[PDB]
């Protein structure tokens, strides 16, 4: 994504967010029951001598739903939490088991 | 298209609209490497495919003019003015008699 004017590189979507479309001015935030965890995503670093940025790794395109037996309640997150005794989650992508 | 997750269930239960269950691992349609089917787990529909019917052995392919970006979508998303989708290779699965 990119939200500024006159940029030489785009910005990598962070963990907990995704950019599904093309040319987004903002990154979409993962919703409860989903998560994005891309650990290699990074922003370009500007070579202070030549003023050219090099290292960009893109983030996630789509959010991963929580697996069966796991759930997620907060929106911007990078993990799924297995819920405790007395509760179950038999579907993928549950906001509360 | 059917599953049973606990012992002694009276009847097979149908996979919910967003999911599917194939005949086996070998004859399964789009289904990733490590995923195996043993009759206890309905699997979501890959991005670009969708499903809206209960108890289906395969997901349906999104048509030209629409897209599916998330996983396990009951319905396909319609392309909006300013954009389009044209995949000429998209095709539904054909059934053997």
């Amino acid at each position: 994504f990119n939200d500024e004017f006159s940029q030489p590189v785009c910005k990598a979507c962070w963990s907990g967010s995704f950019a599904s479309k093309r040319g987004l001015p903002t990154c979409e935030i993962a919703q409860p029951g989903t998560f994005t965890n891309v650990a290699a995503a990074a922003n370009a670093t500007f070579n202070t001598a030549t003023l050219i940025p090099t290292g960009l790794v893109k983030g996630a395109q789509a959010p991963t739903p929580c697996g069966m037996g796991y759930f997620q309640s907060s929106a911007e997150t990078t993990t799924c939490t297995a819920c405790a005794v007395g509760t179950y989650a038999d579907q993928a992508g549950l906001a509360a088991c | 298209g059917y599953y049973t997750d606990v012992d002694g269930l009276p009847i097979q239960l149908p996979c919910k609209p967003g999911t599917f269950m194939p005949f086996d691992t070998a004859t399964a349609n789009l289904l990733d490497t490590g995923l195996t089917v043993d009759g206890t787990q309905c699997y979501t529909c890959q991005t670009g495919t969708f499903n809206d019917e209960f108890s289906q052995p395969v997901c349906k392919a999104c048509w030209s003019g629409s897209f599916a970006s998330k996983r396990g979508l009951p319905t396909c998303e319609i392309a909006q003015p300013g954009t389009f989708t044209n995949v000429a290779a998209a095709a539904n699965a054909t059934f053997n008699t």
Binding site: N37, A60, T64, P65, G67, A92 | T44, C45, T47, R71
Partner: peptide
């Protein structure tokens, strides 16, 4: 990540 097709980001 059980029941999740197309695989996904590791937890």
């Amino acid at each position: 990540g059980g029941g999740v097709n197309q695989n996904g980001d590791p937890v």
